[PDB]
């Protein structure tokens, strides 16, 4: 009998096989059970091995024979995945046939060092005004989306994914962005409706949906983010730009906690092992922006975190808040009073900042940020409204208009030039003489008008990437003329 390349299960239960033998098994190696089940060897102990089963332990008896595959976990990669729905290991689950990817990568590779990177400078357009202007996201960033239940996080992610269609359908090649959506611990029907939604917007020809749903064993939910991040590192390391969305990163932590507590590792705070920082840091540190010597590609990341009762001092929310280059709060109090997307712009930040905004959006959002900052510190008076001087009155009459410009609807991202035009109209002052309730209508009208007649001006803003004083004057004329006839 062989007890180096083969072993036999001493015990099983709750998904943690205890194997005896496998003396040559490496740590974090993929062994295979006699029942066609795979597993990952996590605990190497003097007397046994702790294997986490990728599936149901109903099929793992005691005394079964386990054979080591000799390789660390690896996943397929390539543009052969684009438009598919794969599971935590590359297996297709959309029933469109095999995947047919030549290459492979290791899920647990290390991030690029300090020299390969270069400072984040390109803008990653999310097509959401509140984000693209006030909390911008560059390429190579890691911008946490942290919020409560049903506040609109997945919708922010899907608007971002849908927006890139305008770039991916063009001919410019350094603006193309390929999206990956890792869906962790989600009802399968949610992922199915999401894939349908992406197909509707035709945004599923450059998207890879990695699916680790609720029924999946804990190791698959633990492993889905790394599978997605490897499929994204493939595009990063080939001069292409990627955007990976983990949704959520709290359920990966829960699955990891389950495996640890079943392997009997010292609990720690909230029963989370001591590796729930290392676990997330060594994942989120793979979002980079390689310099030209390494291809110039990049890989953005938008981890999604759910916070219970707006408690952002919990364990995992703070672990992932101290790792990332910003955060987009989504408060529900604002969600229900009309502000949708409910991006609290007080708590939201982007440590990258305006270094990742197009010169036009810099030109405009630079002053929009200050106008809203001033409004937010006299917001309380809004109820009293009267009994106050013209100074604060004008402050909170500009703030209300600016706020109502940032409202936006499901699955309808706006091109950067149109966001710039709308915010220009709003902040330069061509709206302070308008009843707030009508502002949205004006927007939804003005936008369309500009889209129809003045396409040349929008083209010039888009290409020049700046509001030249000639374009500035033309835009002022357009706004004045339209606002006159409203």
């Amino acid at each position: 009998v062989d007890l180096e390349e083969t072993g036999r299960v001493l015990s099983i239960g709750d998904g943690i096989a205890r194997v005896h033998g496998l003396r040559n098994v490496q740590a974090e190696e993929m062994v295979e059970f006699s029942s066609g089940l795979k597993g990952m060897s996590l605990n190497l102990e003097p007397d046994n091995v702790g294997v986490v089963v990728f599936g149901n332990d109903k099929l793992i008896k005691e005394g079964d024979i386990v054979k080591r595959t000799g390789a660390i976990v690896d996943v397929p990669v390539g543009e052969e995945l684009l438009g598919r729905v794969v599971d935590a290991l590359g297996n297709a689950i959309d029933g469109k046939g095999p995947i047919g990817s030549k290459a492979r990568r290791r899920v647990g590779l290390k991030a690029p060092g300090i020299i390969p990177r270069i400072s984040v400078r390109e803008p990653m357009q999310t097509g959401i005004k509140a984000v693209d202007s006030l909390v911008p996201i560059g390429r190579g960033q890691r911008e946490l989306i942290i919020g409560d239940r049903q506040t609109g996080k997945t919708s922010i992610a899907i608007d971002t994914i849908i927006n890139q269609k305008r770039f991916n359908d063009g001919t410019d090649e350094k603006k193309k962005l390929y999206c990956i959506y890792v869906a962790i611990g989600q009802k399968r029907s949610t992922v199915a409706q999401l894939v349908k939604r992406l197909t509707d917007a035709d945004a599923m020809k450059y998207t890879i949906v990695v699916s680790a749903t609720a029924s999946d064993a804990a190791p698959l939910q633990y492993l889905a983010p790394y599978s997605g991040c490897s499929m994204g590192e493939y595009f990063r390391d080939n001069g292409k730009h990627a955007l990976i969305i983990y949704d959520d990163l709290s359920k990966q932590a829960v699955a990891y906690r389950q495996m640890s507590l079943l392997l009997r590792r010292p609990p720690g705070r909230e029963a989370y092992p001591g590796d729930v920082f290392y676990l997330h840091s060594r994942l989120l540190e793979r979002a980079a922006k390689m310099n030209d010597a390494f291809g110039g590609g990049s890989l953005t990341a938008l981890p999604v975190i759910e916070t219970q009762a707006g408690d952002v001092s919990a364990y995992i929310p703070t672990n992932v808040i101290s790792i990332t280059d910003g955060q987009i709060f989504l408060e529900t109090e604002l969600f229900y009073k009309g502000i949708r997307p409910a991006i609290n712009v007080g708590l939201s930040v982007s440590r990258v900042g305006s270094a990742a905004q197009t010169r036009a959006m810099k030109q405009v959002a630079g002053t929009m940020k200050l106008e809203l900052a001033q409004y937010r510190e006299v917001a309380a008076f809004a109820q009293f409204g009267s009994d106050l001087d013209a100074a604060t009155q004008q402050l909170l009459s500009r703030g209300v208009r600016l706020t109502e410009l940032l409202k936006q609807g499901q699955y309808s991202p706006m091109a950067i030039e149109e966001q710039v035009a709308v915010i220009y109209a709003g902040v330069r002052g061509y709206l302070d003489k308008l009843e707030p309730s009508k502002i949205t209508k004006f927007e939804n009208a003005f936008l369309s008008h500009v889209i129809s007649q003045h396409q040349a001006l929008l083209g010039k803003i888009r290409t020049d990437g700046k509001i030249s004083e000639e374009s500035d004057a033309k835009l002022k004329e357009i706004v004045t003329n339209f606002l006159a006839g409203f």
Partner: protein
Amino acid sequence: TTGRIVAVIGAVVDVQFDEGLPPILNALEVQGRETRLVLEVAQHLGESTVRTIAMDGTEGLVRGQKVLDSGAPIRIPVGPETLGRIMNVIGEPIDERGPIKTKQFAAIHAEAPEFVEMSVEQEILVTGIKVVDLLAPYAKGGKIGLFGGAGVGKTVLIMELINNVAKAHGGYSVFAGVGERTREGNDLYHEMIESGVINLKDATSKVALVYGQMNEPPGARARVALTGLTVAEYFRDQEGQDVLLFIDNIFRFTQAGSEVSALLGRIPSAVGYQPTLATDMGTMQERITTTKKGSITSVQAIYVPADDLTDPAPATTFAHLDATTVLSRAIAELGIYPAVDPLDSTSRIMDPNIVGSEHYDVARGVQKILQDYKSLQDIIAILGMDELSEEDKLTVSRARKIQRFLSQPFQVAEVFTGHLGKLVPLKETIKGFQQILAGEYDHLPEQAFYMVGPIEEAVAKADKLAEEH
């Protein structure tokens, strides 16, 4: 095979075998019991020992007793014969009318529909309840949750939903009662018999009750959900028909696992819950789904321990529902019944495309006015309400009117309120809330809207109050 008991600790029994070993989830029958005791295998500890959870009280077990491996997981009767009956976790009847004689048996453990088998259609399911239909419309084939503290209206609301929908349903129905009062189980059984839904004489029953009430040891409360779910699975697949599945409560399915966890040798998780809470619940909630080969309109009541919606159990369940109606204790204190919280109940079909532009605009208007009222109450606390401006006294008055109008009298609450239960089709709700928002009822007192159906009834009640004044 045949093993022998070796240790009994609480509801956890270890059994040692000498023949082959029984795989996990198998059911082992203990030999020498007056009533069938079934142990469901749960762990292999090595040395041909298995740790198991007894589905029924382990009183009077003896070390060395003999245990026979049935050879397959708990198998339960299924088919159109279980309609009108009552079943244990192990499927044997508990309504004293003889055996459930079926052709079909099903194992209560079975994988979930694959991703290639899901449906993606959504059509509103009118329930006749103003708040539920307006702010958080349900959906045919969707999973629905009622998150409540203790004594807020979960059970009365689920009885109202049964009465309404199950009676007017072409397909079958199932009510799995997991670990809640036995008084309530008997009450429901008699209510159905007296309402024709169940029928003792002939084969015309549309409900297949299953009960694991709170006197069952934890091994049983943690499985009866799977048993009711298996009956619903069959009706969904083999009958190829629509199904309803009311579960009450789905917290006890987690609580029982927590109860047995420590004795199984597991380090406890955050709040004393088992480390496997999330997956032990996903493997269940992922079988309650519509598919291309059927449809289940599952409704589930969910205890929220101490009204703490951030507890791990409700917090984890929130992700498995297509629509949640968070009953609230604060609203129930104001006397508004149902207590549904308008600013916490959500849905997935509340979109301008799935329910229409006007419905969506009205729902969002209701939510926004209530939120504005919430903000105003802080000021009203200090200034008094006479100091409020005249654009806000209107807001407060309208918000109070809407709060009252969201209440409604159910047909199953006639014992409490005395009023007559009403159903408000969707059009009346949308029209009435449109009118209340527009200002077409600033001249009626707010109490005119308390516990009435359509808006015209509020007008009539206002007239009657005026006359009797």
